[PDB]
Amino acid sequence: HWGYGKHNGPEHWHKDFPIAKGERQSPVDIDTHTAKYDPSLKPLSVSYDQATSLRILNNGHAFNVEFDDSQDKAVLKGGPLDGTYRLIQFHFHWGSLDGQGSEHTVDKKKYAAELHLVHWNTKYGDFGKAVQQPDGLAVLGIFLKVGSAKPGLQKVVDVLDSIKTKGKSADFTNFDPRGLLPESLDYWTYPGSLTTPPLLECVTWIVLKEPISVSSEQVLKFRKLNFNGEGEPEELMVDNWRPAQPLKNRQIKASFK
Ligand SMILES: N[C@H](Cc1ccccc1)C(=O)O
Ligand SMILES: [Hg+2]
Ligand SMILES: [Zn+2]
């Protein structure tokens, strides 16, 4: 099975998923001096007031905080997006050390972790159909740096003990994702893909420039999770990030000047 190790990591993914060497793969390095302000970009709208979280799951490569997307309760619109995208789940990518962990990089700088809020275009009916379209998904990427603790993240941190191993899940209702957002919504955007197999190229990426700060204690809890299942030797869940991929024929646009 694919993973992040020496024998099953990102450099091996192309064998089972040829698109790994595709034309619009993610993540990418965001060269701030090459990105251009785009006046055509509309205001970004993040409406998470009615968000309904339901469960948190350790899927063997990260943990997903799942939401009820049977209706428009938590949606992302505006910006480079046409239409409405519904929040289905969010997860993170982090490192074994604070100096690495993010997937996207800014002028080659790696952050301690990166949050991905995944949304699907409602015009396609369901997530499965959306990932078969070039404009099927919109992922809001948020960088995490180590410093002061993030109050809105503690609820996630404290429940990780109950889903330490692969396959474990726990009820996780009433979690407000608004507490994970930085102050500013300034962002960079480009067309890309899922960063984990099947690496489908159906994502409009919206990466916020302002990182949120989390405490060393909070990130350390992330690093206590396991890639392995219960009853198997312990493999700490760390460095579950894919490196930057070639930008190729793409242009990264900035929402700010
Ligand atoms: N990256 C998908 C795993 C995944 C699917 C759906 C939700 C979250 C994660 C895969 O491993 O096949
Ligand atoms: Hg696609
Ligand atoms: Zn991700």
Side-chain angles (χ1 to χ4, degrees):
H1 187 69
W2 69 269
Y4 292 96
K6 181 63 179 182
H7 303 80
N8 68 358
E11 223 67 61
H12 286 281
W13 298 354
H14 74 95
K15 284 174 286 179
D16 281 311
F17 308 98
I19 199 172
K21 295 179 176 294
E23 298 301 300
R24 57 178 282 186
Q25 288 291 290
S26 298
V28 299
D29 172 58
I30 298 166
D31 186 277
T32 64
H33 299 289
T34 299
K36 185 252 188 64
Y37 168 61
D38 189 342
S40 66
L41 288 173
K42 300 179 180 60
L44 194 188
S45 176
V46 180
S47 304
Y48 292 163
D49 55 301
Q50 295 298 71
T52 304
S53 62
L54 300 169
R55 186 187 69 157
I56 188 171
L57 166 76
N58 178 323
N59 58 32
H61 61 70
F63 63 83
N64 289 173
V65 170
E66 316 167 339
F67 291 76
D68 165 33
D69 57 343
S70 60
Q71 308 184 67
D72 288 309
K73 294 185 177 183
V75 302
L76 180 69
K77 53 185 177 62
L81 309 175
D82 296 307
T84 302
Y85 289 66
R86 286 185 188 170
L87 176 66
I88 175 169
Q89 59 102 315
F90 73 70
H91 58 273
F92 303 78
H93 295 273
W94 61 93
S96 52
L97 303 171
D98 309 323
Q100 64 195 63
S102 67
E103 298 201 304
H104 287 89
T105 52
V106 183
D107 292 330
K108 291 299 196 299
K109 178 197 185 312
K110 291 177 174 71
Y111 283 93
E114 187 175 325
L115 166 64
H116 289 161
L117 291 133
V118 187
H119 314 71
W120 53 276
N121 199 323
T122 60
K123 70 182 180 181
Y124 297 127
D126 68 61
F127 181 85
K129 291 297 174 302
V131 295
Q132 304 290 57
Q133 321 294 159
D135 60 348
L137 301 185
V139 181
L140 182 56
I142 299 173
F143 295 121
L144 275 69
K145 61 182 294 296
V146 178
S148 300
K150 190 65 175 177
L153 176 69
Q154 199 52 44
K155 182 144 60 182
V156 172
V157 172
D158 294 314
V159 74
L160 295 187
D161 296 298
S162 65
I163 61 161
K164 182 178 180 180
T165 49
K166 183 197 300 295
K168 290 190 172 300
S169 69
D171 296 308
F172 202 62
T173 55
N174 306 100
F175 178 74
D176 198 330
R178 290 178 296 187
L180 299 174
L181 307 180
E183 183 182 305
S184 176
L185 292 178
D186 286 344
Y187 67 81
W188 289 288
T189 180
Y190 75 100
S193 73
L194 302 174
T195 67
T196 53
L199 307 166
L200 297 173
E201 308 187 316
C202 328
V203 186
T204 291
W205 278 93
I206 297 170
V207 181
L208 299 191
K209 175 176 66 177
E210 195 191 324
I212 59 168
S213 294
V214 299
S215 70
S216 186
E217 294 62 50
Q218 295 183 310
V219 185
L220 283 173
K221 292 297 182 179
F222 277 37
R223 298 178 187 141
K224 296 186 176 183
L225 288 165
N226 288 185
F227 277 132
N228 56 290
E230 172 184 47
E232 300 170 59
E234 180 173 54
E235 303 171 55
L236 294 183
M237 185 176 274
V238 298
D239 294 315
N240 53 354
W241 51 279
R242 182 194 199 189
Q245 303 299 307
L247 185 62
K248 293 192 175 182
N249 189 57
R250 288 177 293 176
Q251 192 166 57
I252 299 185
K253 306 171 185 305
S255 74
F256 56 99
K257 190 185 68 177

